[PDB]
């Protein structure tokens, strides 16, 4: 089968504007999968049926311990 879900989940704090065709365009509040973090400046993940580079400034390690 398939067990063990790898990859981090980063959220887009705001809409980003990719200048290069390699980057990935996302909108404020968009789940992203950051598996490759070799470049602290430029990351590589997939959000909307797409896979491109993502800025490590617009997104942030999802953090929100909810209880209710």
Curated annotation (Swiss-Prot):
Domain SH3: 8-62
MF-aspect GO terms: SH3 domain binding
The keyword Acetylation is annotated on this UniProt entry: yes
Cellular component, GO annotation: extracellular region; ficolin-1-rich granule lumen; secretory granule lumen
Tissue distribution: Ubiquitously expressed. Present in osteoclasts (at protein level).
Biological process terms in GO annotation: ossification; signal transduction
Annotated localization: Cytoplasm
Cystine pairings recorded for this chain: none
Keywords: Acetylation, ANK repeat, Cytoplasm, Phosphoprotein, Repeat, SH3 domain
Main location, first listed in the record: cytoplasm
Domain remarks in the Swiss-Prot or TrEMBL record: The SH3 domain mediates interaction with SMN1.
Purpose: Induces bone resorption, acting probably through a signaling cascade which results in the secretion of factor(s) enhancing osteoclast formation and activity.
Quaternary structure and partners: Interacts with SRC and SMN1. Interacts with FASLG.
Protein name per the record: Osteoclast-stimulating factor 1
Residues of the full protein shown: 15 to 69 of 214
